[PDB]
C-alpha cells in the first residue's frame, strides 16, 4: 500500500514505542510495523526500476524485510510478556535493519 506510507508507518511507530507508557501501546505499534513490513516487502523501490523479480537486488530487497519481521516478532514476544523496557530496547535495535537496506536501495 505505497512504499512511502509503509515506511512512514515503521518510522512513526518507532516514536510511539520510545514514548510509550504500557506494553499494550507498544504491542499495538509493533503490530502496525509488522504489517507495514510485509506490505512494503511486496513493492519495488524507485532504484529497482526495471529489475526482474528474480534479480539479486529484488531478492535482497525482499530478504531485508524478512530479517526485520523476525526481529519484530522477537520484540513482540517481550510485549505480550509485559516486558516493556526490554521491548522498548529491542525496538531500538531495529535501526540496524533500517540502515542496511537504505544504504543499498534508497
Ligand atoms: C528495505 C528492505 C528497507 C528496510 C528494512 C527499511 N527501509 Fe525505509 N525505505 C526503504 C526505501 C527503498 C525507501 C525509499 C522510498 C521512496 O519513496 O524513495 C525508504 C524510505 C524510508 C523513509 C522515508 C519515507 C518518506 O517519507 O519518503 C523512512 C522514514 C523510512 N524508510 C523508515 C524506515 C525505518 C524506521 C525502518 C526500520 C524500522 C526502515 N525504513 C526499514 C527501504 C527500507
Ligand atoms: Ca512517493
Ligand atoms: Ca513522506
Ligand atoms: Ca502517508
Ligand atoms: Ca510524519
From Swiss-Prot:
Heme b binds at residues 7, 102. One of its GO terms (molecular function) is heme binding. One of its GO terms (cellular component) is periplasmic space. GO terms for biological process: electron transport chain. Residues 47-60 have a biased composition (Basic and acidic residues). Binds 1 heme b (iron(II)-protoporphyrin IX) group per molecule. Its cofactor is heme b. It is found in: Periplasm. Residues 38-60 are annotated as: Disordered. Keywords: Electron transport, Heme, Iron, Metal-binding, Periplasm, Signal, Transport. Belongs to the cytochrome b562 family. Monomer. Electron-transport protein of unknown function. This is Soluble cytochrome b562. It comes from Escherichia coli. The lineage of its organism: Bacteria, Pseudomonadati, Pseudomonadota, Gammaproteobacteria, Enterobacterales. The gene is cybC. The chain holds residues 23 to 128 of 128 of the full protein.
Amino acid at each position: 500500500a505505497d512504499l512511502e506510507d509503509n515506511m512512514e508507518t515503521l518510522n512513526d511507530n518507532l516514536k510511539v514505542i520510545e514514548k510509550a507508557d504500557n506494553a499494550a501501546q507498544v504491542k499495538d505499534a509493533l503490530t502496525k510495523m509488522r504489517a507495514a513490513a510485509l506490505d512494503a516487502q511486496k513493492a519495488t523501490p524507485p532504484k529497482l526500476e526495471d529489475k526482474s523479480p528474480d534479480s539479486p537486488e529484488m531478492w535482497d530487497f525482499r530478504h531485508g524485510f524478512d530479517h526485520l519481521v523476525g526481529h519484530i516478532d522477537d520484540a513482540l514476544k517481550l510485549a505480550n510478556e509485559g516486558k516493556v523496557k526490554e521491548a522498548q530496547a529491542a525496538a531500538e535495535q531495529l535501526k540496524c535493519h533500517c540502515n542496511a537496506c537504505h544504504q543499498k536501495y534508497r
